Ligand binder design. Structure first.
Ligand code: CA
Ligand code: CA
Ligand code: CA
Ligand code: ZN
Ligand code: ZN
Length: 162
């Protein structure tokens, strides 16, 4: 049996930040992430819970180069991050390119921004064409980060509304 549009069967997800980036203070990273998950669960029946150890549906880690999977990182620039669609094991997980410089401001590569998009993948969404959507594959940022009606239509189509 092959599923083409996998989704989480539980609207009650647990995530875990496996390791941190030296680029930013632990509380900042913790904020950018919990606040990227906030975007998604507001417009759906999704419940996210942080977990420091144990089982986590979504594992988050900052890594670099070849990190075991088959989507190695290219050093500075190029890809900045990538996530896996809903599924067992590595599915739902998000890996950020440690070679990038992660900021909490307008400088190149704001973590919250990139994180909101990768989390869209862990929840089952794919890329958008609409350049004003969070799911658009190119890095953009204007101070505030919110879901576009596009991301909202895409995500509710899978789980439901709020
Ligand atoms: Ca997982
Ligand atoms: Ca890179
Ligand atoms: Ca770094
Ligand atoms: Zn990876
Ligand atoms: Zn993407």
């Amino acid at each position: 049996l092959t599923e083409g549009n996998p989704r989480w069967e539980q609207t009650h997800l647990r995530y875990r930040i496996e390791n941190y980036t030296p680029d930013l203070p632990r509380a900042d990273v913790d904020h950018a992430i919990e606040k990227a998950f906030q975007l998604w669960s507001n417009v759906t029946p999704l419940t996210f819970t942080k977990v420091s150890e144990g089982q986590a549906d979504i594992m988050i880690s900052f890594v670099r180069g070849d990190h075991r999977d088959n989507s190695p990182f290219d050093g500075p620039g190029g890809n900045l991050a990538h996530a896996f669609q809903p599924g067992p094991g590595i599915g739902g997980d998000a890996h950020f390119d440690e070679d990038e410089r992660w900021t909490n401001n307008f400088r190149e590569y704001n973590l919250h921004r990139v994180a909101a998009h990768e989390l869209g993948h862990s929840l089952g969404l794919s890329h958008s064409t609409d350049i004003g959507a969070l799911m658009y594959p190119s890095y953009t940022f204007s101070g505030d980060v919110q879901l576009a009606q596009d991301d909202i239509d895409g995500i509710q189509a899978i789980y439901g509304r709020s």
